[PDB]
């Protein structure tokens, strides 16, 4: 089974859950998965009612790992309050800069994800599920297709799964270059065969989603926790890590570290610990200047002793860690972030459409040293006015990281003025 070439992303875990198999950079097929007790959580789940499973996932305190942190139990509970048919969607779009964690589960332990999808689908009474995977992950696509056929052959998919009376097919859909299709509504829109334009909310997918029907969208990693919850029980699971943010967390670490990769750690871990204790410290042992929290936030070196939780003074985001050291030009880096939002705005809202473009266009002039005073004053203004009238999260955050760089590194920006 020859698949496209993939780089071997380093992975390390102190919990040995989501990365139990995926810490090794190869495809774990069904026989090997079955040898680790794979699909036994599914068998257990099918002897429970859907309601019991919803309850177990609720009492586990599992929160969505896609960014928003929404409690998975309550989300499932909302969808089942509305009449069927109902749809389950696995969000595998992972297009945010610095994020490369979902792919390793997909490419190395697909059966973990599939098992999660089946349990989750049965829990909300969904007879059709979808994996929406970005088009720049072709190997993941092909690996998932083959894994699905394997599971089908073993009787874990199809009609009347293991005499349970439950029917499920999992369809795999591919993106074609659009960060915005990771937003749940725009994903459904793409799944319906249209442009990836986010829908006004409310209504939310759990009420009106795919074909206007109750739809649950969950992140790959959220789903991958479900087998563990069924297997261990809610009471044991909730005691993993800190109580406010329970469960294993995956931290993608990149940039100027000695050991860039995916790290499975508890959320009570510190930013300093991620970089130095796990990621092996900085390259050349240069001083850390800044940490870009993907394309969302910018933390300085005076802020490394903060937990990696969704606490007030926590790192938050999706725990994405891009390290910049002392020689790295952060206005050059800020430009790169600007350029991302420019290429990814869907264009529906005027301040986002125009603001994402102008932020990048003007910052390039500042970087190249050809900006006028009016270009500078205008960059500032554009940066604080991407948000208004916006109907999705991208517009609300397109200027956040850059604004923090202006506030936290004023001396470096003065150099360009």
């Amino acid at each position: 089974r020859s698949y496209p070439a993939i780089p071997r992303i380093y992975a390390e875990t102190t919990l040995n859950m989501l990365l139990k198999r995926a810490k090794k950079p190869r495809v774990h097929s069904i026989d090997e998965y079955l040898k680790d007790g794979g699909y036994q959580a599914l068998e257990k789940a099918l002897n429970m009612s859907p309601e019991e499973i919803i309850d177990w996932v609720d009492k586990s305190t599992l929160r969505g790992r896609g960014g928003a942190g929404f409690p998975t139990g309550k989300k499932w509970k909302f969808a089942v309050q509305n009449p069927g048919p109902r749809y389950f969607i696995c969000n595998a779009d992972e297009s945010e800069p610095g994020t490369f964690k979902d792919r390793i589960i997909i490419e190395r332990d697909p059966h973990l994800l599939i098992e999660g999808i089946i349990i989750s689908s049965y829990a909300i009474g969904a007879n059709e599920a979808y994996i929406y995977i970005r088009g720049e992950y072709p190997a993941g696509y092909y690996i998932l297709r083959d894994a699905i056929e394997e599971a089908k052959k073993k009787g874990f998919l199809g009609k009347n799964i293991l005499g349970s009376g439950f029917d499920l097919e999992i369809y795999v859909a591919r993106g074609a270059g659009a960060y915005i299709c990771g937003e749940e509504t725009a994903l459904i829109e793409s799944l319906e065969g249209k442009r990836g334009h986010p829908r006004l909310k409310p209504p939310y997918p759990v009420q009106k989603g795919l074909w206007g029907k109750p739809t649950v969208v969950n992140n790959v990693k959220t789903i991958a926790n479900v087998p563990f919850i069924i297997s261990m029980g809610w009471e044991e699971y909730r005691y993993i890590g800190p109580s406010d943010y329970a469960g294993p967390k995956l931290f993608p670490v990149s940039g100027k570290v000695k050991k860039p990769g995916v790290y499975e750690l508890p959320m009570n871990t510190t930013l300093r610990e991620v970089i130095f204790k796990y990621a092996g410290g900085t390259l050349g042992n240069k001083k850390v200047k800044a940490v870009f929290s993907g394309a969302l936030d910018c933390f300085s070196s005076e802020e490394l002793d903060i937990p990696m939780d969704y606490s007030p003074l926590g790192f938050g985001g999706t725990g994405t860690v891009i390290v910049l050291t002392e020689e790295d030009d952060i206005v050059e880096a800020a430009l790169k972030i600007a350029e991302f939002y420019e290429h990814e705005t869907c264009g529906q809202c005027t301040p986002c459409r125009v603001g994402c473009y102008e932020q990048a266009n003007l910052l390039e002039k500042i970087y190249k040293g050809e900006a006028t005073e009016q270009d500078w004053e205008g960059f500032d203004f554009v940066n604080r006015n991407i948000q208004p009238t916006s109907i999705c999260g991208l517009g609300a955050v397109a200027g956040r990281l850059i604004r923090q760089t202006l506030e936290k590194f004023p001396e470096e920006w003065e150099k360009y003025r």
Binding site: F100, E136, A173, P260, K336
Partner: protein, 155 residues
């Protein structure tokens, strides 16, 4: 304009795969670009007919999704990440090596129609920065000598 049967078979299978046929629009477009080296403009009308969609819907879709290219035919698309992490770790060195070897910059196609360099946003391999793809295959760039070996695999 009519597709070859070979291609039409694959397109039909994607269309039969989903419960509704219009959900196969992206899989169909991928298949067309794979087969021709680009999306021919004249392909969209007959695709729209198979999907039971209006043409202008398909035009809007092709326009929206950046993987698809209607301008330039290329056997091998070298997608080079230009986002923040790869920038830090040496996108500019990769592009220079590509220029030294192939004689082309981002957005250009070699005169033989063999390779096109395509600048892309983060490819979700940031730990192995700087990252590039050659069609479906994906790699970290280490050096010009190493890149030259990899490119020699595509004939």
């Amino acid at each position: 304009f009519e597709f070859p049967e070979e291609l039409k078979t694959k397109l039909q299978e994607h269309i039969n795969y989903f419960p509704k046929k219009r959900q196969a629009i992206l899989l169909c477009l991928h298949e067309i670009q794979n087969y021709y080296g680009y999306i021919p403009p004249e392909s969209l009308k007959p695709l729209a007919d198979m999907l039971e969609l209006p043409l202008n819907h398909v035009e809007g879709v092709v326009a929206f999704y950046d993987m698809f290219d209607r301008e330039d035919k290329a056997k091998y698309r070298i997608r080079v990440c230009v986002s923040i992490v790869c920038h830090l770790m040496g996108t500019n060195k990769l592009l220079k090596a590509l220029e030294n070897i192939l004689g082309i910059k981002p957005g250009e196609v070699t005169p033989d129609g063999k390779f096109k360099i395509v600048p892309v946003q983060c490819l979700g391999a940031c730990s192995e920065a700087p990252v590039f793809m050659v069609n479906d295959d994906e790699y970290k760039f280490e050096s010009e000598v190493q890149l030259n070996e990899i490119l020699s695999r595509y004939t």
